[PDB]
């Protein structure tokens, strides 16, 4: 009795809502991102005795930063040369090197240069993947995507790379983290904590698996949707890194062709004898990791065997491991890696896998726009840490399930990293009762 209304300010309660998120930058940069925004130092506090539901499928900031990655790529690629006048008819014979069938463009053509008087004859070096065959005589050839879109050369000195990015909350909005180790991608966390901004998430572009990423806390974690057994993509997050060594062994000769102030870059000549580019895997780490992954996956599926095959059909972005290293894009044969089976009941030896490289790459989510990678001189070596897998499943039948790699959609790769965070809106104006009146 004798209760009256009172109001309170600074109330600790929140709702869940969409918002626009702020981003951070780095001191050193390539030089919209190169000097902006700010580069703060974050801190973290633990929300004791707080339980909150999380869901890595429904959360919105993944799509937000997907749009941000697209917009940054477009703004970076906007002040660049358009390669339209290269769409003329190519006459290729391709017999200059010791072996020709590997690369198969070595292609003469006419180009206007610096006078607009009359086109002059030039020749360059190209890969047969980027070359398509015109009708009639086989020696006639065309560029691959010019029947569909315009092709832009990337300027080499503004090259974009996985710079770590921190996502800052705006004022009045809080970010929740769920520091629990065995979080399953959905459900209630009882280990809630808050930050001002996230850690250094890198824009990693890869297919069939992901790399240069974070690592799990306990053992290997499996994240998947649970609306139905019919799933698009299942994420596997490793607790232990495996090392990959990639190499393009040959040196290349960059040559420049002048088109106004632009200067088109092409390949002149490969130095020395031709060797095919390849990657290397520690065999014991790979097969032990596969055994651990399969014997952990059979928790979900009770009595059926587990068997792996490589993917079938589609473009090269899903049949092969594709990624970027340096300035060069690699497509790696993964047939030998995924040939295992298991019944349902430290660095010895090395698997080598063959690769192919191509210069004209479509946008990694979309067709109707393509970009031309510039040639990179010299031999290229790379070392990376693979942190997880993106898998899909077949139907199969009784006694046997089947899992094969996939993951052509680039958004699920960033969904594999931003599973922790969630954005909430603060509602600090909770009312209350009290045993007190107001002065009259």
């Amino acid at each position: 009795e004798n209760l009256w209304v009172t109001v309170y300010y600074g109330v600790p309660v929140w709702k869940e809502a969409k918002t626009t998120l702020f981003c951070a930058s780095d001191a050193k940069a390539y030089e919209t991102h190169a000097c902006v925004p700010t580069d703060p130092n974050p801190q973290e506090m633990v929300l004791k005795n707080v339980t909150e539901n999380f869901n890595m499928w429904k959360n919105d900031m993944v799509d937000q930063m997907h749009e941000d990655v697209i917009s940054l790529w477009d703004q970076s690629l906007k002040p660049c040369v358009k390669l339209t006048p290269l769409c003329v008819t190519l006459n290729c014979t391709n017999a200059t090197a010791s072996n020709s069938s590997i690369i198969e463009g070595m292609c003469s053509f006419n180009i206007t240069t610096e006078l607009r008087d009359k086109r002059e004859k030039k020749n360059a070096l190209f890969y047969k993947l980027d070359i398509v065959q015109l009708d009639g005589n086989s020696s006639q050839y065309r560029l691959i995507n010019c029947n569909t879109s315009v092709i832009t050369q990337a300027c080499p000195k503004v090259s974009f790379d996985p710079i770590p990015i921190h996502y800052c909350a705006p004022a009045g909005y809080a970010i929740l983290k769920c520091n629990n180790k065995t979080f399953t991608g959905t459900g209630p966390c009882n280990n809630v904590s808050t930050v001002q901004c996230t850690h250094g998430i890198k824009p990693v572009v890869s297919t069939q698996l992901l790399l240069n990423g974070s690592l799990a806390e306990g053992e290997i974690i499996i994240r998947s949707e649970n609306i139905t057994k019919n799933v698009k993509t299942i994420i596997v997050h490793l607790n232990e890194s495996v090392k990959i060594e990639c190499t393009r062994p040959n040196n290349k000769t960059r040559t420049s062709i002048r088109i106004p102030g632009q200067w088109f870059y092409a390949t002149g000549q490969v130095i020395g004898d031709i060797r095919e580019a390849y990657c290397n895997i520690n065999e014991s780490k790979w097969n032990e990791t596969l055994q651990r992954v399969s014997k952990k996956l059979k928790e979900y599926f009770p009595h059926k065997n587990i068997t792996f095959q490589p993917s079938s059909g589609g473009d090269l972005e899903i049949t092969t491991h594709s990624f970027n290293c340096g300035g060069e894009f690699f497509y790696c044969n993964t047939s030998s890696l995924f040939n295992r089976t298991y019944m349902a009941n430290n660095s010895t030896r090395t698997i080598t896998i063959h690769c192919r490289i191509k210069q004209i790459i479509n946008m990694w989510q979309e067709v109707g726009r393509a970009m031309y990678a510039p040639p990179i001189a010299g031999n290229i070596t790379c070392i990376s840490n693979i942190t997880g897998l993106l898998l899909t499943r077949d139907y199969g039948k009784n006694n046997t399930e089947t899992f094969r790699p996939g993951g052509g959609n680039m958004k699920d790769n960033w969904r594999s990293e931003l599973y922790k965070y969630k954005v909430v809106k603060i509602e600090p104006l909770g009312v209350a009762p009290t045993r007190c009146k107001r002065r009259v």
Partner: antibody
Framework: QVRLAQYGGGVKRLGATMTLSCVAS????????IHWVRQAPGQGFELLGY????????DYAGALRERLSFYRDKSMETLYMDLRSLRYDDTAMYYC???????????????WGSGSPVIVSS | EIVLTQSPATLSASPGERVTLTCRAS??????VAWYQHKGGQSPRLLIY???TRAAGVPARFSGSASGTEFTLAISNLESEDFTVYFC????????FGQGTRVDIKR
């Protein structure tokens, strides 16, 4: 608004390889999966397989992995079946269907195409 | 794997009345069940998805319900145009189809 036109069909000779085509018109072509369903006369429907038009990823039924093939062209947004080695039991009404799906899972079908009947005999 | 047994094969009613079709699942499919109306030759139309939700543009006289491992399609105001085939679909797993059921004129 959305339409799924189908072309090819009629009578095909025994033992040959046949091709069906579909054209989608009024929606974002990369967003929705496409399934291929058929109905034999006197029998219920059954699924042959499905295709992702974004990356060209197929998936096939267990009994017909060797005879089927799906692919697509993204610029003319056109989808193609190839079926090899036609047999007499393949007499059926064939449809493409668009599939509604979430970010992680697939769900019910919304639209059915005009279809393409196939009569196999020599 | 999953076998949708639609029941019965044929239902008979006078126009305007109520009619009820059953679909029996072989095992648990949660509520990943849809119901479709099949026209006399044309493209079938989605009636109901998730076992109780009427789809967009569908007339309101249609209704559907779940009872665990059994699903129910009910038409309250059965029209002359509605004397056609209806069939039940599931998508909890790999995709299967029932036999369908023809609604004809009672006499």
């Amino acid at each position: 608004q959305v339409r799924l036109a189908q072309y090819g069909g009629g009578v095909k000779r025994l033992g040959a390889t046949m091709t069906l085509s579909c054209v989608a018109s009024g929606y974002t072509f990369n967003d929705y999966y496409i399934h291929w369903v058929r109905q034999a006369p006197g029998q219920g429907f059954e699924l042959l397989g499905y295709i992702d038009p974004a990356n060209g990823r197929p998936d096939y039924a267990g009994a017909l992995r060797e005879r089927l093939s799906f692919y697509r062209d993204k610029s003319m947004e056109t989808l193609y079946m190839d079926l090899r080695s036609l047999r007499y039991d393949d007499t059926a009404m064939y449809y493409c269907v668009r599939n509604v799906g979430t970010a992680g899972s697939l769900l019910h079908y919304d639209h059915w195409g005009s279809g393409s009947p196939v009569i196999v005999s020599s | 794997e999953i076998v949708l047994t639609q029941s019965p094969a044929t239902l008979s009613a006078s126009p305007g009345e109520r009619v009820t079709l059953t679909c029996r699942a072989s095992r648990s499919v949660r509520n990943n069940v849809a119901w479709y109306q099949h026209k006399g030759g044309q493209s079938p139309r989605l009636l109901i998805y998730d076992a109780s939700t009427r789809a967009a543009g569908v007339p309101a006289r249609f209704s559907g319900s779940a009872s665990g491992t059994e699903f129910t399609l009910a038409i309250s105001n059965l029209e002359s145009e509605d004397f056609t085939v209806y069939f039940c679909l599931q998508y909890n797993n790999w995709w299967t189809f029932g036999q369908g059921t023809r609604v004809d004129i009672k006499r």
